[PDB]
Amino acid sequence: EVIPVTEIPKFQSRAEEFFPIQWYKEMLNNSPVYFHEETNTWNVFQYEHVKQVLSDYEFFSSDGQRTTIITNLTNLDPPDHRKARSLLAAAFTHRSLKNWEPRIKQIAADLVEAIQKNPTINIVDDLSSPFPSLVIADLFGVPVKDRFKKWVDILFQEKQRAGAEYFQYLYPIVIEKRSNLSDDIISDLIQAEFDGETFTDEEIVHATMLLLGAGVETTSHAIANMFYSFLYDDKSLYSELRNNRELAPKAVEEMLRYRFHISRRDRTVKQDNELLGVKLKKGDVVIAWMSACNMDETMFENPFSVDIHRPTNKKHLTFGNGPHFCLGAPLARLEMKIILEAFLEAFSHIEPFEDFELEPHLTASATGQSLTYLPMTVYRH
Numbered sequence: 001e002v003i004p005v006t007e008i009p010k011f012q013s014r015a016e017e018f019f020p021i022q023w024y025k026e027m028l029n030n031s032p033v034y035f036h037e038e039t040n041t042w043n044v045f046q047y048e049h050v051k052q053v054l055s056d057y058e059f060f061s062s063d064g065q066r067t068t069i070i071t072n073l074t075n076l077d078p079p080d081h082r083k084a085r086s087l088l089a090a091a092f093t094h095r096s097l098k099n100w101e102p103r104i105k106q107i108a109a110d111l112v113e114a115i116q117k118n119p120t121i122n123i124v125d126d127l128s129s130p131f132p133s134l135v136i137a138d139l140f141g142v143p144v145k146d147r148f149k150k151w152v153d154i155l156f157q158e159k160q161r162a163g164a165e166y167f168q169y170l171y172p173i174v175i176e177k178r179s180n181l182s183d184d185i186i187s188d189l190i191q192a193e194f195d196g197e198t199f200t201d202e203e204i205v206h207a208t209m210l211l212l213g214a215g216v217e218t219t220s221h222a223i224a225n226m227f228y229s230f231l232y233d234d235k236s237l238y239s240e241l242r243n244n245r246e247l248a249p250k251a252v253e254e255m256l257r258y259r260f261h262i263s264r265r266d267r268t269v270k271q272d273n274e275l276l277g278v279k280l281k282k283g284d285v286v287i288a289w290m291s292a293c294n295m296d297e298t299m300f301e302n303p304f305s306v307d308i309h310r311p312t313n314k315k316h317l318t319f320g321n322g323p324h325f326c327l328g329a330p331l332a333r334l335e336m337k338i339i340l341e342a343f344l345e346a347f348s349h350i351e352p353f354e355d356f357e358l359e360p361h362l363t364a365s366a367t368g369q370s371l372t373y374l375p376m377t378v379y380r381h
Protein backbone atom coordinates (compact mmCIF):
# COMPACT_ATOMS: atom_id res chain seq x y z
CA GLU A 1 0.00 0.00 0.00
CA VAL A 2 1.59 3.32 -1.18
CA ILE A 3 1.01 5.97 1.61
CA PRO A 4 0.52 9.51 0.17
CA VAL A 5 2.88 11.36 2.64
CA THR A 6 1.76 14.65 0.88
CA GLU A 7 -1.55 14.42 2.90
CA ILE A 8 0.13 14.67 6.39
CA PRO A 9 1.22 18.36 6.30
CA LYS A 10 -1.48 19.39 3.68
CA PHE A 11 0.61 22.48 2.63
CA GLN A 12 -1.40 25.52 1.32
CA SER A 13 1.29 26.48 -1.31
CA ARG A 14 4.10 24.86 -3.37
CA ALA A 15 6.38 27.54 -1.72
CA GLU A 16 5.60 26.21 1.79
CA GLU A 17 6.23 22.53 0.73
CA PHE A 18 9.58 23.70 -0.82
CA PHE A 19 10.75 25.12 2.59
CA PRO A 20 8.33 24.09 5.38
CA ILE A 21 10.19 25.62 8.39
CA GLN A 22 6.92 27.01 9.93
CA TRP A 23 5.36 23.45 9.86
CA TYR A 24 8.63 21.90 11.28
CA LYS A 25 8.57 24.46 14.15
CA GLU A 26 4.83 23.67 14.82
CA MET A 27 5.42 19.89 14.85
CA LEU A 28 8.61 20.11 17.05
CA ASN A 29 6.93 22.53 19.60
CA ASN A 30 3.37 21.06 19.68
CA SER A 31 3.30 17.53 18.18
CA PRO A 32 6.77 15.91 17.96
CA VAL A 33 5.36 12.33 18.04
CA TYR A 34 2.21 12.64 15.95
CA PHE A 35 -0.41 10.03 14.99
CA HIS A 36 -2.03 10.88 11.63
CA GLU A 37 -5.45 9.10 11.60
CA GLU A 38 -6.15 9.60 7.83
CA THR A 39 -2.89 7.81 6.69
CA ASN A 40 -2.69 5.58 9.84
CA THR A 41 0.96 6.71 10.37
CA TRP A 42 3.05 7.74 13.35
CA ASN A 43 5.28 10.77 12.61
CA VAL A 44 8.47 11.73 14.49
CA PHE A 45 10.30 15.05 14.22
CA GLN A 46 12.83 15.21 17.10
CA TYR A 47 16.46 14.31 16.40
CA GLU A 48 16.72 11.48 19.00
CA HIS A 49 13.44 9.81 17.75
CA VAL A 50 14.28 10.19 14.02
CA LYS A 51 17.75 8.74 14.62
CA GLN A 52 16.28 5.76 16.56
CA VAL A 53 13.66 5.00 13.81
CA LEU A 54 16.29 5.17 11.02
CA SER A 55 18.87 2.86 12.71
CA ASP A 56 17.16 0.47 15.21
CA TYR A 57 16.11 -2.17 12.62
CA GLU A 58 15.35 -4.74 15.40
CA PHE A 59 12.31 -2.51 16.22
CA PHE A 60 11.87 -0.44 12.99
CA SER A 61 12.08 -2.62 9.86
CA SER A 62 12.78 -1.34 6.30
CA ASP A 63 10.84 -4.36 4.79
CA GLY A 64 7.13 -3.75 5.73
CA GLN A 65 3.88 -4.09 3.63
CA ARG A 66 3.21 -0.24 3.43
CA THR A 67 5.59 2.52 2.04
CA THR A 68 5.97 6.36 1.57
CA ILE A 69 7.54 6.03 -1.97
CA ILE A 70 15.54 -4.55 -8.47
CA THR A 71 17.82 -5.59 -5.55
CA ASN A 72 15.25 -4.12 -3.05
CA LEU A 73 18.45 -3.21 -1.03
CA THR A 74 16.65 -0.27 0.64
CA ASN A 75 13.87 -2.77 1.64
CA LEU A 76 16.26 -5.29 3.36
CA ASP A 77 17.16 -5.48 7.07
CA PRO A 78 20.35 -7.19 8.34
CA PRO A 79 21.21 -9.96 7.94
CA ASP A 80 19.92 -10.07 4.30
CA HIS A 81 21.06 -6.41 3.70
CA ARG A 82 24.77 -7.19 4.34
CA LYS A 83 25.50 -9.03 1.05
CA ALA A 84 23.63 -6.54 -1.22
CA ARG A 85 25.24 -3.54 0.60
CA SER A 86 28.79 -5.06 0.43
CA LEU A 87 28.53 -5.90 -3.31
CA LEU A 88 27.31 -2.36 -4.17
CA ALA A 89 29.87 -0.78 -1.77
CA ALA A 90 32.66 -2.39 -3.92
CA ALA A 91 32.03 0.55 -6.39
CA PHE A 92 32.29 3.23 -3.61
CA THR A 93 35.82 2.75 -2.15
CA HIS A 94 38.07 5.49 -0.67
CA ARG A 95 40.34 4.88 -3.71
CA SER A 96 37.46 5.43 -6.21
CA LEU A 97 36.32 8.66 -4.41
CA LYS A 98 39.93 9.99 -4.61
CA ASN A 99 40.20 9.07 -8.38
CA TRP A 100 36.72 10.55 -9.13
CA GLU A 101 37.58 14.05 -7.86
CA PRO A 102 39.71 15.22 -10.90
CA ARG A 103 37.16 13.60 -13.33
CA ILE A 104 34.24 15.45 -11.65
CA LYS A 105 36.34 18.66 -11.56
CA GLN A 106 36.83 18.43 -15.40
CA ILE A 107 33.03 18.08 -15.86
CA ALA A 108 32.29 21.05 -13.53
CA ALA A 109 35.00 23.18 -15.27
CA ASP A 110 33.33 22.52 -18.70
CA LEU A 111 29.80 23.38 -17.39
CA VAL A 112 30.98 26.65 -15.76
CA GLU A 113 33.22 27.48 -18.78
CA ALA A 114 29.99 27.45 -20.92
CA ILE A 115 28.39 30.24 -18.74
CA GLN A 116 31.61 32.09 -17.74
CA LYS A 117 30.71 35.24 -19.83
CA ASN A 118 26.94 35.16 -19.11
CA PRO A 119 25.40 38.22 -17.49
CA THR A 120 22.51 36.02 -16.17
CA ILE A 121 22.28 32.24 -15.72
CA ASN A 122 19.63 29.60 -14.98
CA ILE A 123 21.04 27.32 -12.22
CA VAL A 124 18.64 24.52 -13.16
CA ASP A 125 19.36 24.14 -16.90
CA ASP A 126 23.01 25.40 -16.78
CA LEU A 127 24.22 23.49 -13.68
CA SER A 128 21.96 21.57 -11.22
CA SER A 129 20.06 19.40 -13.77
CA PRO A 130 22.95 18.36 -16.10
CA PHE A 131 25.86 18.03 -13.67
CA PRO A 132 24.91 14.90 -11.62
CA SER A 133 23.83 13.05 -14.84
CA LEU A 134 27.11 13.91 -16.63
CA VAL A 135 29.01 12.78 -13.47
CA ILE A 136 27.25 9.40 -13.03
CA ALA A 137 27.63 8.60 -16.79
CA ASP A 138 31.44 9.18 -16.51
CA LEU A 139 31.66 7.18 -13.24
CA PHE A 140 29.66 4.29 -14.83
CA GLY A 141 32.17 4.16 -17.73
CA VAL A 142 29.43 4.70 -20.42
CA PRO A 143 30.94 5.17 -23.96
CA VAL A 144 32.19 8.82 -24.41
CA LYS A 145 29.50 9.43 -27.16
CA ASP A 146 26.49 8.62 -24.82
CA ARG A 147 27.77 10.95 -21.97
CA PHE A 148 21.75 10.29 -20.48
CA LYS A 149 19.91 13.13 -18.56
CA LYS A 150 16.90 11.97 -20.68
CA TRP A 151 16.87 8.59 -18.78
CA VAL A 152 16.13 9.84 -15.17
CA ASP A 153 13.60 12.43 -16.53
CA ILE A 154 11.68 9.47 -18.16
CA LEU A 155 12.65 7.05 -15.28
CA PHE A 156 10.39 9.34 -13.13
CA GLN A 157 3.39 3.13 -17.07
CA GLU A 158 5.93 5.59 -18.55
CA LYS A 159 8.19 3.72 -16.03
CA GLN A 160 7.85 0.11 -17.45
CA ARG A 161 8.83 1.41 -20.98
CA ALA A 162 11.79 3.58 -19.72
CA GLY A 163 13.30 0.74 -17.56
CA ALA A 164 13.08 -1.72 -20.52
CA GLU A 165 14.85 0.89 -22.78
CA TYR A 166 17.66 1.52 -20.22
CA PHE A 167 18.12 -2.27 -19.81
CA GLN A 168 18.56 -2.85 -23.58
CA TYR A 169 21.09 0.07 -23.74
CA LEU A 170 23.22 -1.01 -20.72
CA TYR A 171 23.06 -4.86 -20.78
CA PRO A 172 25.49 -5.17 -23.74
CA ILE A 173 27.86 -2.57 -22.08
CA VAL A 174 28.15 -4.78 -18.90
CA ILE A 175 28.88 -7.94 -20.99
CA GLU A 176 31.59 -5.93 -22.93
CA LYS A 177 33.19 -4.60 -19.66
CA ARG A 178 33.27 -8.16 -18.12
CA SER A 179 35.93 -8.90 -20.85
CA ASN A 180 37.31 -5.29 -20.83
CA LEU A 181 37.58 -4.01 -17.17
CA SER A 182 38.41 -0.29 -16.49
CA ASP A 183 38.35 2.03 -13.39
CA ASP A 184 34.59 2.58 -13.35
CA ILE A 185 31.52 1.58 -11.27
CA ILE A 186 30.32 -1.12 -13.75
CA SER A 187 33.82 -2.81 -13.66
CA ASP A 188 33.91 -2.63 -9.81
CA LEU A 189 30.38 -4.20 -9.61
CA ILE A 190 31.55 -7.03 -11.97
CA GLN A 191 34.58 -7.77 -9.66
CA ALA A 192 32.55 -7.49 -6.37
CA GLU A 193 32.38 -10.70 -4.21
CA PHE A 194 30.69 -11.54 -0.88
CA ASP A 195 31.13 -15.00 0.74
CA GLY A 196 31.75 -16.35 -2.81
CA GLU A 197 28.55 -14.68 -4.22
CA THR A 198 28.75 -12.26 -7.23
CA PHE A 199 26.26 -10.19 -9.25
CA THR A 200 25.05 -11.49 -12.64
CA ASP A 201 25.18 -9.09 -15.65
CA GLU A 202 21.39 -8.53 -15.29
CA GLU A 203 21.80 -7.69 -11.54
CA ILE A 204 24.57 -5.16 -12.43
CA VAL A 205 22.23 -3.36 -14.85
CA HIS A 206 19.61 -3.20 -12.05
CA ALA A 207 22.34 -1.98 -9.59
CA THR A 208 23.16 0.95 -11.99
CA MET A 209 19.39 1.81 -12.20
CA LEU A 210 19.22 1.89 -8.35
CA LEU A 211 22.24 4.27 -8.33
CA LEU A 212 20.54 6.52 -10.99
CA GLY A 213 17.30 6.63 -8.91
CA ALA A 214 19.27 7.32 -5.69
CA GLY A 215 21.95 9.79 -6.85
CA VAL A 216 20.84 12.02 -9.80
CA GLU A 217 17.61 13.95 -8.93
CA THR A 218 18.55 14.09 -5.16
CA THR A 219 21.93 15.68 -5.99
CA SER A 220 20.29 18.04 -8.56
CA HIS A 221 17.73 19.19 -5.91
CA ALA A 222 20.52 19.68 -3.31
CA ILE A 223 22.63 21.79 -5.74
CA ALA A 224 19.64 23.93 -6.90
CA ASN A 225 18.57 24.58 -3.29
CA MET A 226 22.17 25.47 -2.25
CA PHE A 227 22.25 28.22 -4.96
CA TYR A 228 18.70 29.27 -3.92
CA SER A 229 20.04 29.78 -0.35
CA PHE A 230 22.82 32.15 -1.56
CA LEU A 231 20.11 34.36 -3.15
CA TYR A 232 17.34 34.21 -0.48
CA ASP A 233 18.65 33.04 2.96
CA ASP A 234 21.99 34.60 4.13
CA LYS A 235 22.78 36.97 1.18
CA SER A 236 26.32 37.60 2.68
CA LEU A 237 27.31 33.89 2.57
CA TYR A 238 28.36 33.94 -1.12
CA SER A 239 30.81 36.84 -0.37
CA GLU A 240 32.17 34.93 2.65
CA LEU A 241 32.89 31.93 0.37
CA ARG A 242 34.59 34.20 -2.25
CA ASN A 243 36.74 35.69 0.56
CA ASN A 244 37.93 32.25 1.83
CA ARG A 245 37.93 29.58 -0.89
CA GLU A 246 38.43 26.75 1.76
CA LEU A 247 34.84 27.23 3.15
CA ALA A 248 33.04 25.27 0.35
CA PRO A 249 32.73 21.94 2.30
CA LYS A 250 31.30 23.79 5.36
CA ALA A 251 28.79 25.52 3.06
CA VAL A 252 27.80 22.17 1.48
CA GLU A 253 27.20 20.53 4.90
CA GLU A 254 25.02 23.53 6.10
CA MET A 255 22.96 23.46 2.81
CA LEU A 256 22.36 19.70 3.32
CA ARG A 257 21.17 20.43 6.92
CA TYR A 258 19.18 23.61 6.07
CA ARG A 259 17.94 23.52 2.40
CA PHE A 260 17.30 19.84 1.44
CA HIS A 261 13.47 19.39 1.81
CA ILE A 262 11.61 17.24 2.41
CA SER A 263 13.66 14.32 3.83
CA ARG A 264 11.46 11.57 5.31
CA ARG A 265 11.84 7.79 5.45
CA ASP A 266 9.33 5.20 6.70
CA ARG A 267 9.82 2.05 8.78
CA THR A 268 7.40 -0.67 9.91
CA VAL A 269 7.36 -1.58 13.62
CA LYS A 270 8.84 -5.12 13.95
CA GLN A 271 8.12 -5.61 17.72
CA ASP A 272 5.73 -3.85 20.13
CA ASN A 273 7.63 -1.08 21.99
CA GLU A 274 7.44 2.39 23.58
CA LEU A 275 10.96 3.55 22.52
CA LEU A 276 9.40 6.82 21.08
CA GLY A 277 7.40 7.50 24.32
CA VAL A 278 4.10 6.09 22.84
CA LYS A 279 3.05 2.40 22.72
CA LEU A 280 3.56 1.07 19.16
CA LYS A 281 2.41 -2.32 17.84
CA LYS A 282 4.04 -4.65 15.35
CA GLY A 283 2.85 -3.53 11.86
CA ASP A 284 2.47 0.21 12.73
CA VAL A 285 4.18 2.56 10.22
CA VAL A 286 6.48 5.32 11.49
CA ILE A 287 7.66 8.20 9.26
CA ALA A 288 10.95 9.84 10.43
CA TRP A 289 11.03 13.48 9.14
CA MET A 290 14.82 14.05 8.89
CA SER A 291 14.51 17.64 7.41
CA ALA A 292 12.48 18.59 10.53
CA CYS A 293 14.98 16.99 13.00
CA ASN A 294 17.79 18.93 11.20
CA MET A 295 16.11 22.04 12.78
CA ASP A 296 15.81 20.56 16.33
CA GLU A 297 17.39 23.19 18.64
CA THR A 298 18.50 20.36 21.06
CA MET A 299 21.11 19.34 18.42
CA PHE A 300 21.50 22.52 16.25
CA GLU A 301 21.92 25.95 17.99
CA ASN A 302 19.92 28.74 16.22
CA PRO A 303 18.53 26.02 13.93
CA PHE A 304 16.35 28.24 11.65
CA SER A 305 19.45 30.38 10.73
CA VAL A 306 22.21 29.63 8.20
CA ASP A 307 25.49 29.13 10.06
CA ILE A 308 28.28 27.26 8.21
CA HIS A 309 30.43 27.46 11.41
CA ARG A 310 27.90 25.63 13.67
CA PRO A 311 30.07 22.76 14.99
CA THR A 312 27.18 20.19 14.98
CA ASN A 313 26.31 20.58 11.25
CA LYS A 314 27.91 17.16 10.37
CA LYS A 315 25.21 15.52 12.62
CA HIS A 316 22.33 16.25 10.17
CA LEU A 317 20.33 13.16 9.12
CA THR A 318 19.81 14.12 5.38
CA PHE A 319 21.69 10.90 4.44
CA GLY A 320 20.03 8.71 7.06
CA ASN A 321 21.67 6.79 9.89
CA GLY A 322 22.54 3.12 10.52
CA PRO A 323 22.70 0.24 8.01
CA HIS A 324 20.99 2.14 5.14
CA PHE A 325 23.16 5.30 5.53
CA CYS A 326 23.50 6.74 2.01
CA LEU A 327 26.18 4.82 0.05
CA GLY A 328 26.45 7.97 -2.19
CA ALA A 329 27.00 10.49 0.67
CA PRO A 330 30.75 11.00 -0.05
CA LEU A 331 30.02 11.34 -3.79
CA ALA A 332 27.10 13.74 -3.21
CA ARG A 333 29.28 15.93 -0.93
CA LEU A 334 32.11 15.81 -3.51
CA GLU A 335 29.80 16.83 -6.41
CA MET A 336 28.31 19.75 -4.42
CA LYS A 337 31.82 20.91 -3.28
CA ILE A 338 33.35 20.72 -6.79
CA ILE A 339 30.44 22.55 -8.58
CA LEU A 340 30.45 25.27 -5.81
CA GLU A 341 34.28 25.67 -6.05
CA ALA A 342 34.16 25.92 -9.91
CA PHE A 343 31.31 28.48 -9.63
CA LEU A 344 33.16 30.58 -6.98
CA GLU A 345 36.20 30.73 -9.32
CA ALA A 346 34.09 32.16 -12.16
CA PHE A 347 31.66 34.57 -10.41
CA SER A 348 32.52 37.35 -7.93
CA HIS A 349 28.86 38.11 -6.95
CA ILE A 350 25.35 36.73 -7.54
CA GLU A 351 21.94 38.41 -7.22
CA PRO A 352 18.32 37.21 -7.56
CA PHE A 353 15.98 38.59 -10.25
CA GLU A 354 13.72 41.12 -8.38
CA ASP A 355 10.79 39.77 -10.48
CA PHE A 356 11.39 36.01 -9.87
CA GLU A 357 8.22 34.31 -8.52
CA LEU A 358 8.77 31.04 -6.61
CA GLU A 359 5.22 29.56 -6.84
CA PRO A 360 5.10 29.26 -10.70
CA HIS A 361 8.63 27.73 -10.79
CA LEU A 362 8.00 24.77 -8.42
CA THR A 363 6.89 21.29 -9.64
CA ALA A 364 5.92 18.15 -7.66
CA SER A 365 8.86 15.80 -7.05
CA ALA A 366 9.73 12.74 -4.91
CA THR A 367 11.06 15.23 -2.24
CA GLY A 368 7.96 17.52 -2.34
CA GLN A 369 8.51 20.51 -4.68
CA SER A 370 11.57 21.14 -6.90
CA LEU A 371 12.68 24.32 -8.78
CA THR A 372 11.87 24.28 -12.56
CA TYR A 373 13.95 27.47 -13.00
CA LEU A 374 16.31 29.55 -10.85
CA PRO A 375 17.62 32.73 -12.46
CA MET A 376 20.46 34.88 -11.14
CA THR A 377 22.51 37.84 -12.30
CA VAL A 378 26.24 37.02 -12.06
CA TYR A 379 29.33 39.25 -12.13
CA ARG A 380 33.06 38.73 -12.78
CA HIS A 381 35.78 40.69 -10.82
Ligand code: HEM
Binding pocket: 054, 062, 073, 074, 075, 085, 088, 210, 211, 212, 214, 215, 216, 218, 219, 222, 260, 265, 266, 318, 319, 320, 321, 323, 324, 325, 326, 327, 328, 329, 331, 332
Ligand atom coordinates in the same frame (compact mmCIF):
# COMPACT_ATOMS: atom_id res chain seq x y z
C1 HEM B 1 22.19 14.84 -1.91
C2 HEM B 1 22.07 13.64 -2.45
C3 HEM B 1 21.46 12.49 -1.74
C4 HEM B 1 20.60 12.35 -0.68
C5 HEM B 1 19.89 13.46 0.04
C6 HEM B 1 20.49 10.96 -0.37
C7 HEM B 1 19.72 10.48 0.66
C8 HEM B 1 19.66 9.12 1.01
C9 HEM B 1 19.03 8.58 2.17
C10 HEM B 1 18.26 9.35 3.20
C11 HEM B 1 19.23 7.23 2.17
C12 HEM B 1 18.73 6.27 3.31
C13 HEM B 1 17.41 5.64 3.07
C14 HEM B 1 16.81 4.98 4.30
O1 HEM B 1 17.28 5.00 5.46
O2 HEM B 1 15.73 4.41 4.10
C15 HEM B 1 20.03 6.94 1.00
C16 HEM B 1 20.39 5.68 0.61
C17 HEM B 1 21.10 5.39 -0.51
N1 HEM B 1 21.68 6.28 -1.32
FE1 HEM B 1 21.62 8.25 -1.20
N2 HEM B 1 21.25 10.28 -1.25
C18 HEM B 1 21.91 11.12 -2.07
C19 HEM B 1 22.82 10.86 -3.08
C20 HEM B 1 23.15 9.59 -3.52
C21 HEM B 1 24.08 9.28 -4.53
C22 HEM B 1 24.88 10.29 -5.32
C23 HEM B 1 24.15 7.91 -4.63
C24 HEM B 1 24.92 7.02 -5.60
C25 HEM B 1 25.56 7.38 -6.71
C26 HEM B 1 23.27 7.39 -3.64
C27 HEM B 1 23.03 6.04 -3.41
C28 HEM B 1 22.27 5.56 -2.32
C29 HEM B 1 22.07 4.11 -2.09
C30 HEM B 1 22.62 2.98 -2.94
C31 HEM B 1 21.32 3.99 -0.97
C32 HEM B 1 20.83 2.71 -0.30
C33 HEM B 1 21.74 2.17 0.75
C34 HEM B 1 21.11 1.05 1.58
O3 HEM B 1 19.85 0.92 1.61
O4 HEM B 1 21.95 0.32 2.18
N3 HEM B 1 22.69 8.43 -2.97
N4 HEM B 1 20.28 8.11 0.30
